[PDB]
């Protein structure tokens, strides 16, 4: 019958973000997405303001075809890692996300621009890290307060981090708020931050006709 993909332990989002153990959903194509009720988070604790909306785009798109891009980030330390997101115990992070931190107490104002002139739509998923204390904010991103402002030709979005102590998840009180931005052909995107940017490593390919759907079941076909 149909082409069903089982998330098993990785949910629709953790597969898009690339949390540890979720490599098996990379390159996967499906018509229906089996979101098991037994799924668990396995990386840094996060939250998606429109979790139901973002979860919808991933399920409806019908494919996890990630495409790489090189952002020449300025002087920030790239490939950050934390012990709540261990893969093979390597302190790790989302394999689709890039955590940027200051190098020698110098986090510079960034300004990168990525253009789509192709024949597919691009899905940029990025985040904003919310430090727990103003000392943790400074130890990671020198400047205070933080700033993230991702823009297109028709959409300007600006996120201001909320510093504070949240409930303990994997023994951690900080959080990362994940957002998304869709860049249609002819449009472009502009990352601009002075701190707290959970930068992306690329974009997913979007189908112009999205016929897939999601399910939350119990067994394989």
């Amino acid at each position: 019958p149909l082409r069903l993909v089982d998330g098993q332990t990785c949910d629709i989002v953790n597969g898009a973000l690339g949390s540890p153990g979720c490599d098996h959903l990379n390159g996967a194509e499906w018509d229906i997405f089996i979101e098991r009720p037994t799924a668990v988070d396995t990386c840094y604790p996060f939250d998606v303001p429109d979790y139901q909306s973002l979860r919808s785009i991933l399920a409806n798109n019908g494919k996890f075809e990630f495409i790489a891009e090189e952002f020449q980030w300025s002087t920030v330390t790239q490939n950050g890692g934390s012990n709540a997101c261990k893969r093979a115990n390597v302190n790790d992070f989302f394999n689709r996300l890039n955590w940027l931190t200051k190098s020698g107490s110098t986090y510079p104002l960034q300004n990168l621009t990525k253009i789509n002139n192709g024949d597919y739509a691009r899905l940029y998923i990025w985040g904003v890290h919310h430090p727990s204390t103003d000392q943790e904010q400074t130890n990671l991103y020198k400047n205070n307060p933080g700033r993230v402002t991702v823009s297109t030709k028709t959409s300007q979005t600006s996120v201001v981090p909320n510093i504070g102590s949240r409930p303990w998840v994997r023994g951690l009180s900080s959080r990362i708020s994940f957002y998304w931005t869709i860049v249609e052909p002819g449009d472009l995107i502009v990352f601009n931050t002075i701190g707290n940017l959970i930068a992306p490593r690329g974009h997913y390919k979007l189908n112009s006709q999205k016929k897939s759907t999601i399910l939350n079941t119990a067994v394989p076909i």
Partner: antibody
């Protein structure tokens, strides 16, 4: 399904020490966070301990900090609570706790154990 | 400070709609406080009802719903049955401290 049962009920005298245990089953114990919550005879609820899925991050309340020491043995699926320097006012039913994070935000203290009674007064 | 107060007891009848509240003494109740609702069935049977202010736990019937009423938290039972007769506890996470539990509301279905 998911199932927790406490054990170790007993009488201790003030100032002594008592160790509580929680036998976990129905889930991979090493991937989830655990806490201890108690209920005084006045039917009030009070949180007393927290431990990460790997035991790296442990936190207590001011009421028992320095006195209580929480631990877990992920290979046996057993949650422990080492109580010491006990006072009268620690008398409560001690519950095993755990949460459930799935639909967007999580639910703290979803799934409770049967609770085992500890009487501080000697 | 950091004292959570909720109703001492509430009474209702089958089929009616009831709302349980949970007020914070430190000020207003915010999404950031992460209101949690627990139900105590007799003989020390506890079951988590609502987490993250509004997210409904897996086994919870759909008639339960949690939301924010003004500066309080609120648990709404829409179409109460006699098996809703239990004590309902609240939990607010205060950054400073941690989870602090209210006095709990004892609900009685008159039947």
């Amino acid at each position: 399904e998911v199932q927790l049962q406490e054990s170790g009920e007993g009488l201790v005298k003030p100032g002594g020490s008592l160790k509580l245990s929680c036998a976990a089953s129905g889930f991979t114990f090493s991937n989830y966070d655990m806490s201890w919550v108690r209920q005084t005879p006045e039917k009030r609820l009070e949180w007393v301990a927290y431990i990460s899925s790997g035991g790296d991050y442990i936190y207590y309340a001011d009421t028992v900090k320095g006195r209580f020491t929480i631990s877990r043995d992920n290979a046996r699926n057993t949650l422990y609570l080492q109580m010491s320097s006990l006072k009268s006012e620690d008398t409560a039913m001690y519950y095993c706790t755990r949460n459930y994070y799935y639909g967007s935000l999580p639910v703290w203290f979803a799934y409770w154990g049967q609770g085992t009674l500890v009487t501080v007064s000697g | 400070q950091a004292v959570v107060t909720q109703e001492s007891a509430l009474t209702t009848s089958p089929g009616e709609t009831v709302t349980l509240t949970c007020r914070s003494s430190t000020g207003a109740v915010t999404t950031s406080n992460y209101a949690n609702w627990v139900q105590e069935k007799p003989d020390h049977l506890f079951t988590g009802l609502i987490g993250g202010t509004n997210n409904r736990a897996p086994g919870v019937p759909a008639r339960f719903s949690g939301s924010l009423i003004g500066d309080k938290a609120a648990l709404t039972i829409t179409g109460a049955q006699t098996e809703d007769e239990a004590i309902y506890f609240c939990a607010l996470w205060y950054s400073n401290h941690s989870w602090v539990f209210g006095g709990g509301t004892k609900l009685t279905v008159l039947g």
